[PDB]
């Protein structure tokens, strides 16, 4: 439920907090430790429904992904194009 010591829900609801992670994912800024872990698992999160991830990993990633699809739509388009070009998460797992 937390990334880098902050409640994930507070990160997602704050442009200031979320943009650090967004930029990390888009190779536009340095990653925090959990930002980096998210980056490593995000292709598997979207394309396989985090088949090989841990429970902690899966919970965090699915929370981020679904908040982003619902309420950060421009950032979703960018993340989807890079990490899930075939749109498997929306078509298979959402
Ligand atoms: Cl941590
Ligand atoms: Cl943490």
TrEMBL record:
Keyword Phosphoprotein attached: no
Keyword terms, alphabetized: Signal
Superkingdom field: Eukaryota
S-S bridge residues: 24-31, 50-53
Name of this protein: Chemosensory protein 3
First and last residues shown, out of full length: 23 to 116 of 127
């Amino acid at each position: 439920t937390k990334y880098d010591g902050i409640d994930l829900d507070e990160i997602l609801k704050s442009d200031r907090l979320f943009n650090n992670y967004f930029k990390c994912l888009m190779d536009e800024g340095r990653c925090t430790p959990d930002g980096n872990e998210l980056k490593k698992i995000l292709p598997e999160a979207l394309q396989t429904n985090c088949a090989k991830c841990s429970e902690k990993q899966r919970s965090g990633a699915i929370k981020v992904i679904n908040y982003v699809i619902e309420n950060r739509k421009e950032q979703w388009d960018a993340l989807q194009k890079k990490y899930d070009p075939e749109n498997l998460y929306v078509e298979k797992y959402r």
